[PDB]
């Protein structure tokens, strides 16, 4: 995380961290169905909300533990 922060500093960008471990669906990758209240955007949209630039350095954390469990 500090490595990515310093890389963002080098390019004078804004850095971010989003954890993907513990996710096995696309509901936190993509959003949710647009037919009800409760639809929730994915972790990427959280990352853009919490960063202040068009061009952040998105850090995808714990990518190796992704597998097909449900929702594809």
């Amino acid at each position: 995380t500090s490595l990515g922060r310093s890389i963002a500093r080098s390019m004078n960008r804004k850095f971010h961290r989003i954890s993907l471990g513990g996710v096995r669906d696309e509901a936190e990758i993509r959003g949710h169905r647009r037919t009800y209240i409760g639809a929730m955007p994915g972790k990427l949209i959280h990352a853009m909300k919490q960063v202040g630039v068009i061009n952040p350095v998105i850090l995808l954390d714990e990518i190796d533990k992704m597998s097909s469990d449900w929702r594809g």
């Binding site: 169905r33 647009r34 037919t35 009800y36």
Partner: protein, 72 residues
Amino acid sequence: DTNQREYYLREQMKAIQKELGGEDGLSDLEALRKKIEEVGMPEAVKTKALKELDRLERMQQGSPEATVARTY
């Protein structure tokens, strides 16, 4: 006159469908209904597409049945 009758019924559905099921999905639903005729489709395909269209025009519920029909 009969065609305008059918499209007046469609006027009823489109006037009441506002903020029901998916308001954004309304445009997708109408586009798919139009593409039913636009794309040269087999008569059995046309009939099952009309089946799913009857499984739409949804003033029943915003249930996943409407969503799965839109995806279909």
